[PDB]
Design a protein around this ligand. Sequence first.
Ligand SMILES: Cn1c(COc2cccc(C(=O)O)c2)nc2ccc(Oc3ccc(Cl)c(F)c3)cc21
Ligand SMILES: [Cl-]
Ligand SMILES: [Cl-]
Lengths: 260, 10
Amino acid sequence: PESADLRALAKHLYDSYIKSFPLTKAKARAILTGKTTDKSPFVIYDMNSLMMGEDKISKEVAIRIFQGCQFRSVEAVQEITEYAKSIPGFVNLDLNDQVTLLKYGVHEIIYTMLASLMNKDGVLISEGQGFMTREFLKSLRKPFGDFMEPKFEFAVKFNALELDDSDLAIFIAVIILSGDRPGLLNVKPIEDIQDNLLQALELQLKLNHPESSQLFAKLLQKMTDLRQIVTEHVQLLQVIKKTETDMSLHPLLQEIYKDL
Amino acid sequence: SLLKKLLLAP
Ligand SMILES: Cn1c(COc2cccc(C(=O)O)c2)nc2ccc(Oc3ccc(Cl)c(F)c3)cc21
Ligand SMILES: [Cl-]
Ligand SMILES: [Cl-]
Protein backbone atom coordinates (compact mmCIF):
# COMPACT_ATOMS: atom_id res chain seq x y z
CA PRO A 1 0.00 0.00 0.00
CA GLU A 2 0.92 3.68 -0.30
CA SER A 3 0.81 3.90 3.50
CA ALA A 4 2.97 0.80 3.87
CA ASP A 5 5.60 2.43 1.66
CA LEU A 6 5.44 5.60 3.74
CA ARG A 7 6.33 3.52 6.79
CA ALA A 8 9.20 1.81 4.93
CA LEU A 9 10.43 5.30 3.98
CA ALA A 10 10.14 6.40 7.60
CA LYS A 11 12.18 3.37 8.72
CA HIS A 12 14.78 3.90 5.97
CA LEU A 13 15.28 7.50 7.10
CA TYR A 14 15.56 6.43 10.73
CA ASP A 15 18.20 3.80 9.94
CA SER A 16 20.07 6.35 7.80
CA TYR A 17 19.78 8.90 10.63
CA ILE A 18 21.34 6.39 13.05
CA LYS A 19 24.24 5.76 10.62
CA SER A 20 24.89 9.47 10.07
CA PHE A 21 24.58 10.96 13.55
CA PRO A 22 26.73 9.40 16.30
CA LEU A 23 24.85 11.04 19.19
CA THR A 24 21.09 10.46 18.97
CA LYS A 25 18.39 12.10 21.05
CA ALA A 26 17.65 8.81 22.84
CA LYS A 27 21.23 8.49 24.07
CA ALA A 28 21.45 12.21 24.76
CA ARG A 29 18.37 12.33 27.01
CA ALA A 30 19.73 9.27 28.81
CA ILE A 31 22.86 11.26 29.60
CA LEU A 32 20.83 14.34 30.55
CA THR A 33 18.50 12.44 32.87
CA GLY A 34 21.35 10.52 34.49
CA LYS A 35 20.53 7.02 33.23
CA THR A 36 23.55 6.22 31.06
CA THR A 37 26.12 3.65 32.16
CA ASP A 38 28.83 5.44 30.18
CA LYS A 39 31.25 8.05 31.53
CA SER A 40 29.35 11.03 32.90
CA PRO A 41 29.90 14.36 31.13
CA PHE A 42 32.40 16.75 32.63
CA VAL A 43 30.51 19.86 33.71
CA ILE A 44 31.77 23.26 32.56
CA TYR A 45 30.09 25.98 34.63
CA ASP A 46 32.81 28.62 35.05
CA MET A 47 36.23 29.82 33.91
CA ASN A 48 38.02 27.40 36.24
CA SER A 49 36.10 24.30 35.11
CA LEU A 50 36.49 25.38 31.48
CA MET A 51 40.22 25.21 32.10
CA MET A 52 39.91 21.75 33.69
CA GLY A 53 37.62 20.51 30.93
CA GLU A 54 40.03 21.80 28.28
CA ASP A 55 42.17 18.82 29.27
CA LYS A 56 39.44 16.26 29.97
CA ILE A 57 37.47 16.71 26.76
CA SER A 58 45.95 32.20 23.42
CA LYS A 59 42.50 33.50 22.50
CA GLU A 60 40.06 34.86 25.08
CA VAL A 61 37.42 32.47 26.44
CA ALA A 62 34.55 34.20 24.62
CA ILE A 63 36.20 33.70 21.23
CA ARG A 64 37.41 30.20 22.08
CA ILE A 65 33.87 29.13 22.93
CA PHE A 66 32.36 30.78 19.85
CA GLN A 67 34.95 29.16 17.60
CA GLY A 68 34.36 25.86 19.38
CA CYS A 69 30.71 25.98 18.32
CA GLN A 70 31.88 26.77 14.79
CA PHE A 71 34.10 23.70 14.74
CA ARG A 72 31.25 21.51 15.96
CA SER A 73 29.15 23.07 13.20
CA VAL A 74 31.73 22.01 10.61
CA GLU A 75 31.48 18.45 11.92
CA ALA A 76 27.65 18.63 11.92
CA VAL A 77 27.51 19.88 8.33
CA GLN A 78 29.41 16.77 7.26
CA GLU A 79 27.10 14.45 9.21
CA ILE A 80 24.04 16.22 7.76
CA THR A 81 25.49 15.94 4.25
CA GLU A 82 25.87 12.18 4.72
CA TYR A 83 22.29 11.97 5.91
CA ALA A 84 21.00 14.03 2.97
CA LYS A 85 22.64 11.63 0.51
CA SER A 86 20.49 8.84 1.95
CA ILE A 87 17.19 10.60 1.28
CA PRO A 88 15.64 8.78 -1.72
CA GLY A 89 16.17 10.85 -4.86
CA PHE A 90 18.59 13.36 -3.33
CA VAL A 91 21.76 12.16 -5.06
CA ASN A 92 19.95 12.15 -8.41
CA LEU A 93 19.10 15.85 -8.14
CA ASP A 94 21.17 18.38 -10.12
CA LEU A 95 24.43 18.59 -8.13
CA ASN A 96 24.32 22.37 -7.79
CA ASP A 97 20.82 22.02 -6.35
CA GLN A 98 22.13 19.52 -3.78
CA VAL A 99 24.72 22.09 -2.79
CA THR A 100 22.06 24.78 -2.58
CA LEU A 101 19.76 22.67 -0.41
CA LEU A 102 22.58 22.01 2.03
CA LYS A 103 23.94 25.55 1.97
CA TYR A 104 20.61 27.04 2.99
CA GLY A 105 19.36 24.15 5.11
CA VAL A 106 22.22 22.95 7.32
CA HIS A 107 21.90 25.50 10.14
CA GLU A 108 18.18 24.80 10.46
CA ILE A 109 19.09 21.14 10.88
CA ILE A 110 21.96 21.93 13.26
CA TYR A 111 19.62 23.83 15.58
CA THR A 112 17.02 21.07 15.41
CA MET A 113 19.53 18.45 16.52
CA LEU A 114 21.17 20.75 19.04
CA ALA A 115 17.84 20.84 20.86
CA SER A 116 18.24 17.08 21.40
CA LEU A 117 21.40 17.77 23.44
CA MET A 118 19.87 20.60 25.48
CA ASN A 119 17.74 21.07 28.56
CA LYS A 120 16.85 24.23 30.44
CA ASP A 121 20.19 24.13 32.28
CA GLY A 122 22.76 23.43 29.60
CA VAL A 123 23.97 21.60 26.52
CA LEU A 124 26.01 18.44 25.91
CA ILE A 125 29.20 18.96 23.93
CA SER A 126 31.66 16.70 22.11
CA GLU A 127 29.28 13.75 21.83
CA GLY A 128 28.40 13.78 25.52
CA GLN A 129 31.91 14.23 26.92
CA GLY A 130 31.00 17.55 28.44
CA PHE A 131 28.05 19.63 29.57
CA MET A 132 28.27 23.41 29.38
CA THR A 133 25.80 25.30 31.54
CA ARG A 134 23.43 27.80 29.98
CA GLU A 135 24.27 30.32 32.70
CA PHE A 136 27.98 30.17 31.90
CA LEU A 137 27.21 30.56 28.19
CA LYS A 138 25.31 33.80 28.72
CA SER A 139 27.82 35.06 31.28
CA LEU A 140 30.22 35.61 28.40
CA ARG A 141 31.16 39.18 27.55
CA LYS A 142 29.46 40.99 24.67
CA PRO A 143 28.41 39.96 22.09
CA PHE A 144 29.06 36.30 22.92
CA GLY A 145 26.87 36.15 26.03
CA ASP A 146 23.72 36.22 23.91
CA PHE A 147 25.00 33.80 21.28
CA MET A 148 22.96 30.77 22.32
CA GLU A 149 20.03 32.04 24.35
CA PRO A 150 17.80 32.02 21.23
CA LYS A 151 18.73 28.36 20.68
CA PHE A 152 18.04 27.33 24.27
CA GLU A 153 14.69 29.14 24.13
CA PHE A 154 13.80 27.29 20.93
CA ALA A 155 14.91 23.92 22.32
CA VAL A 156 12.91 24.07 25.54
CA LYS A 157 9.74 24.65 23.55
CA PHE A 158 10.71 22.17 20.82
CA ASN A 159 11.55 19.44 23.35
CA ALA A 160 8.18 19.97 25.02
CA LEU A 161 6.73 18.30 21.90
CA GLU A 162 8.56 15.10 22.92
CA LEU A 163 9.62 13.97 19.45
CA ASP A 164 11.82 10.89 19.23
CA ASP A 165 14.58 10.02 16.76
CA SER A 166 12.12 8.41 14.36
CA ASP A 167 10.05 11.63 14.18
CA LEU A 168 13.18 13.75 13.84
CA ALA A 169 14.63 11.77 10.93
CA ILE A 170 11.61 12.65 8.77
CA PHE A 171 11.32 16.22 10.11
CA ILE A 172 14.95 16.87 9.11
CA ALA A 173 14.46 15.29 5.68
CA VAL A 174 11.47 17.57 4.99
CA ILE A 175 13.50 20.69 5.80
CA ILE A 176 16.46 19.70 3.63
CA LEU A 177 14.15 19.13 0.65
CA SER A 178 12.83 22.72 0.70
CA GLY A 179 11.93 23.87 -2.80
CA ASP A 180 11.99 27.56 -1.90
CA ARG A 181 15.75 27.91 -1.32
CA PRO A 182 17.37 30.71 -3.35
CA GLY A 183 18.78 29.76 -6.73
CA LEU A 184 17.44 26.22 -7.09
CA LEU A 185 17.54 25.23 -10.77
CA ASN A 186 14.91 22.47 -10.79
CA VAL A 187 12.28 22.95 -8.09
CA LYS A 188 9.74 20.33 -9.25
CA PRO A 189 11.72 17.18 -8.39
CA ILE A 190 12.63 18.64 -5.01
CA GLU A 191 8.99 19.47 -4.28
CA ASP A 192 7.84 16.02 -5.36
CA ILE A 193 10.29 14.42 -2.92
CA GLN A 194 9.30 16.82 -0.12
CA ASP A 195 5.60 16.20 -0.73
CA ASN A 196 6.20 12.48 -0.21
CA LEU A 197 8.33 13.21 2.87
CA LEU A 198 5.55 15.41 4.26
CA GLN A 199 3.02 12.60 3.77
CA ALA A 200 5.45 10.30 5.63
CA LEU A 201 5.83 12.80 8.49
CA GLU A 202 2.08 13.23 8.80
CA LEU A 203 1.51 9.48 9.06
CA GLN A 204 4.48 9.10 11.43
CA LEU A 205 3.02 11.68 13.82
CA LYS A 206 -0.50 10.23 13.67
CA LEU A 207 0.84 6.78 14.55
CA ASN A 208 3.58 7.76 17.03
CA HIS A 209 1.68 10.60 18.78
CA PRO A 210 -2.01 9.69 18.37
CA GLU A 211 -3.09 11.93 21.26
CA SER A 212 -0.90 14.89 20.25
CA SER A 213 -3.47 17.11 18.63
CA GLN A 214 -2.20 19.13 15.66
CA LEU A 215 1.41 17.97 16.11
CA PHE A 216 1.93 18.10 12.34
CA ALA A 217 0.80 21.73 12.18
CA LYS A 218 3.06 22.50 15.12
CA LEU A 219 6.07 21.01 13.34
CA LEU A 220 5.37 22.97 10.17
CA GLN A 221 5.50 26.07 12.37
CA LYS A 222 8.79 24.97 13.97
CA MET A 223 10.25 24.83 10.47
CA THR A 224 9.37 28.52 10.11
CA ASP A 225 10.72 29.20 13.61
CA LEU A 226 14.06 27.62 12.68
CA ARG A 227 14.51 29.96 9.73
CA GLN A 228 14.05 32.88 12.07
CA ILE A 229 16.70 31.46 14.40
CA VAL A 230 19.19 31.20 11.53
CA THR A 231 18.33 34.74 10.47
CA GLU A 232 19.20 36.06 13.94
CA HIS A 233 22.34 33.93 14.12
CA VAL A 234 23.51 35.28 10.76
CA GLN A 235 22.89 38.84 11.95
CA LEU A 236 24.85 38.23 15.15
CA LEU A 237 27.69 36.88 13.03
CA GLN A 238 27.88 40.06 10.99
CA VAL A 239 27.93 42.00 14.25
CA ILE A 240 30.80 39.78 15.41
CA LYS A 241 32.83 39.99 12.20
CA LYS A 242 32.23 43.74 12.33
CA THR A 243 34.03 44.09 15.68
CA GLU A 244 35.96 40.87 16.20
CA THR A 245 39.04 40.83 13.99
CA ASP A 246 41.85 38.28 13.75
CA MET A 247 39.00 35.75 13.93
CA SER A 248 39.42 33.21 11.13
CA LEU A 249 36.36 31.33 9.90
CA HIS A 250 36.53 27.69 8.79
CA PRO A 251 36.38 27.55 4.96
CA LEU A 252 33.36 25.22 5.02
CA LEU A 253 31.47 27.83 7.03
CA GLN A 254 32.80 30.66 4.87
CA GLU A 255 31.23 28.87 1.91
CA ILE A 256 27.89 28.49 3.65
CA TYR A 257 27.80 32.02 5.06
CA LYS A 258 28.74 33.53 1.69
CA ASP A 259 25.85 35.30 -0.05
CA LEU A 260 23.70 34.17 2.89
CA SER B 1 33.06 24.11 -3.68
CA LEU B 2 33.68 22.19 -0.46
CA LEU B 3 30.04 21.16 -0.16
CA LYS B 4 30.18 19.78 -3.70
CA LYS B 5 33.25 17.75 -2.77
CA LEU B 6 31.58 16.30 0.34
CA LEU B 7 28.54 15.41 -1.77
CA LEU B 8 30.63 13.53 -4.34
CA ALA B 9 32.58 11.27 -2.00
CA PRO B 10 30.94 7.83 -1.81
C1 LIG C 1 28.31 25.33 23.07
N1 LIG C 1 29.09 24.35 22.30
C2 LIG C 1 28.69 23.36 21.49
C3 LIG C 1 27.23 23.06 21.21
O1 LIG C 1 26.51 24.26 21.02
C4 LIG C 1 26.48 24.61 19.66
C5 LIG C 1 26.90 23.72 18.67
C6 LIG C 1 26.85 24.10 17.33
C7 LIG C 1 26.40 25.37 16.98
C8 LIG C 1 25.98 26.25 17.97
C9 LIG C 1 25.50 27.59 17.61
O2 LIG C 1 24.98 28.29 18.43
O3 LIG C 1 25.67 27.94 16.32
C10 LIG C 1 26.03 25.87 19.31
N2 LIG C 1 29.68 22.67 20.95
C11 LIG C 1 30.86 23.23 21.42
C12 LIG C 1 32.18 22.94 21.21
C13 LIG C 1 33.17 23.71 21.85
C14 LIG C 1 32.80 24.77 22.70
O4 LIG C 1 33.78 25.53 23.32
C15 LIG C 1 34.48 24.79 24.27
C16 LIG C 1 33.81 23.85 25.08
C17 LIG C 1 34.51 23.11 26.03
C18 LIG C 1 35.87 23.32 26.17
CL1 LIG C 1 36.74 22.40 27.35
C19 LIG C 1 36.53 24.25 25.38
F1 LIG C 1 37.84 24.44 25.54
C20 LIG C 1 35.85 24.99 24.43
C21 LIG C 1 31.45 25.06 22.91
C22 LIG C 1 30.48 24.31 22.29
CL1 LIG D 1 14.20 20.37 27.68
CL1 LIG E 1 16.15 30.06 2.52
